[PDB]
Design a protein around this ligand. Structure first.
Ligand SMILES: Cc1cc2nc3c(=O)[nH]c(=O)nc-3n(C[C@H](O)[C@H](O)[C@H](O)COP(=O)(O)O)c2cc1C
Ligand SMILES: Cc1cc2nc3c(=O)[nH]c(=O)nc-3n(C[C@H](O)[C@H](O)[C@H](O)COP(=O)(O)O)c2cc1C
Ligand SMILES: [Cl-]
Lengths: 168, 168
């Protein structure tokens, strides 16, 4: 039995949460998981914003068409990249960090969903505004987290036709 | 005890391998792990090239910087994205897929490393011409896989200065 592989295969996007907040110890483990990502030339260009402010969460919800569930959580994490530290890899490093965070969540009985910010200038504008992100800090995503309100089922995405040998 | 977190925190880039091939069933599980990634609009734009041809591995080892370990493995997995399927987010989706693949490797006692291809045009061209990739298919990386030659140490990347509360 491989519990890591099981978490990987059972992870799903969770968009509905119980009312209760997530414990600070669990939030910190989510962050620590993200920071364990690999990183081009080990620059470590990620920055994590833990957002619990009701007004900010609601304002972002009301400006992000595919992130309306921000109104229905008490906490979200915004993964950002520092474009001075890694102008050609922050979006790769931070995507790997994001995936660690989502797996960490699944592993601790939490629900989470990756909602895009970058590369959409309208989404970037509101997130940068509400969180006072400096010009060299680019928000990749908003990740609401919470205890799942119901049983959710993973997608089975295996497709042998997306496997190739020695060339296309 | 959280085995998934344990794997996340103990993953490291492994660049030195036992001179022996990896079981096909393990390679398949790597790819299944990759395919389980989240995907913008569920467009699943990933394509995986399993590379066992010696000349292909050696040619990429020669042409790519920081890719010398390709000479020392029997097999590598090249993660690619279909830009017609996901023109704005393929490389984000494919980075999440890549991180699943790396974690899967670590969980099965294998060693792996992300070697950079995207976003460097000269690197992209090497991989494209070696693997006969159609123009709408972009190579993200090359991931050599093997049994680790030696015990390797993970990095502790935790830094509280990269954690922010309610904004920058
Ligand atoms: C986007 C990206 C590009 C990378 N490029 C290379 C590469 O070309 N060659 C290599 O040996 N390692 C490469 N790495 C691995 C990093 O050097 C490594 O993740 C970093 O040193 C942190 O070490 P760790 O993976 O052991 O935690 C890359 C990693 C990422 C995420
Ligand atoms: C780059 C990226 C952007 C995404 N953007 C959003 C988004 O804006 N809103 C949302 O509800 N889900 C978003 N998703 C979640 C996807 O819809 C989801 O991963 C996909 O439907 C597959 O489902 P699964 O995560 O349950 O396997 C995003 C995922 C990725 C990887
Ligand atoms: Cl075999």
């Amino acid at each position: 039995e491989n519990q890591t592989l099981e978490t990987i295969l059972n992870r799903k996007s969770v968009r509905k949460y119980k009312d209760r907040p997530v414990e600070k110890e669990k939030i910190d483990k989510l962050i620590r998981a993200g920071m364990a990502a690999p990183s081009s030339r080990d620059r470590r260009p990620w920055e994590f914003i833990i957002v619990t402010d009701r007004k900010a969460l609601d304002t972002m919800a009301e400006g992000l068409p595919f992130a309306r569930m921000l109104k229905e959580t008490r906490q979200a994490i915004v993964v950002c990249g520092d474009t001075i530290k890694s102008s050609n890899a922050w979006f790769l490093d931070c995507s790997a960090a994001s995936q660690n965070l989502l797996l960490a969540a699944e592993s601790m009985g939490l629900g989470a969903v990756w909602t895009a910010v970058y590369p959409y200038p309208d989404r970037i504008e509101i997130v940068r505004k509400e969180l006072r992100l400096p010009d060299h800090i680019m928000p990749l995503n908003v990740i609401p987290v919470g205890y799942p309100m119901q049983k959710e089922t993973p997608k089975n995405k295996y497709n042998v036709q997306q496997i190739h040998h020695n060339g296309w």
